[PDB]
Amino acid sequence: KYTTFQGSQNFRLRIVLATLSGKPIKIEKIRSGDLNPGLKDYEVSFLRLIESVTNGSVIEISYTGTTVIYRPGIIVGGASTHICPSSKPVGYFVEPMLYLAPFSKKKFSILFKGITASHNDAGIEAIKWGLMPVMEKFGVRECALHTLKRGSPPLGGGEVHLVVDSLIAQPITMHEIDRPIISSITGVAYSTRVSPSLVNRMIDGAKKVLKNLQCEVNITADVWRGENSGKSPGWGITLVAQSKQKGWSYFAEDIGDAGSIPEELGEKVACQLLEEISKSAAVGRNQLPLAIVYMVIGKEDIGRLRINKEQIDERFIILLRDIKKIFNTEVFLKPVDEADNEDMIATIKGIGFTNTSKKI
């Protein structure tokens, strides 16, 4: 009720930081100046998820749907089930609880029902292959995201099951200064209720772009047969590129539209991949906020991560402005030494943080 925020920009990240930090915030004017003003339904359901996982937290929506007074409680979590409303996929409903996994009191065993993939938000293989390695390198040891049923837009019917077991006291400090040495390229091509010939044509598109590079390329074919394949028909692709010696990961995904062509979808995701690698520096442009929140919240110490001028953009700016608003944390950007590339070491002195929610 004290710390006030404006607009529906980065809503769920503002909420997640309020829960992790503990300071009562007040969001106001959520699309008040709009033809159909108010809090959107998917946002409402995400708030419901927050009150499921925490304990003793109070959320008082303004009755007009504009002002949200959030006073965070403590994390308890546990096992539960959530019906993601059919406007946003379970990726958008998992990525925050992914932020908040390893600081709970019991494990996270959440079941999600709904659409399992979309254009805007992350997918199952996107999370499993691109965001898990960030926490697996920050110190979380046993996270998992099972797919009991894979849906597809626009009916879904797909179920995921997130289980997070390592309840670390605080994430260890990250030290990454060298640009990572990229080794292998793998990916997943999945199909729901269309043809195996179609998933092979997707692979054809990706390999057609990737003929040039001398590195190993391998893309698995997941066709979901039978009942556990969900209702609406769809198809999609994701690629990751992995560095073995330090286990770093880069990625891009996209889904086949209603009447697109799998060949140029495969070429599209491949050009997504290579362009992201060029614009990247040790972290993907969308893995970035996970790493930055984790480095801020990590124990009292200077932590170092190399980033790129191509990555420093307006969303990065608004993120770090949020960080200062919540935690009062400066971020120091010293430049790297090599005259060739253009990189800045982001150094964040992580404040003291623990699990004060746990047992002994």
Binding site: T147, P196, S197, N200, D222, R225
Partner: peptide, 21 residues
């Protein structure tokens, strides 16, 4: 087609859909 029909899921990739006289 074949790989579709191939039981590498069932074989391997069930991993990859979750994890004298």
């Amino acid at each position: 087609g074949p790989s579709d029909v191939y039981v590498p899921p069932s074989k391997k990739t069930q991993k990859l859909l979750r994890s004298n006289l």
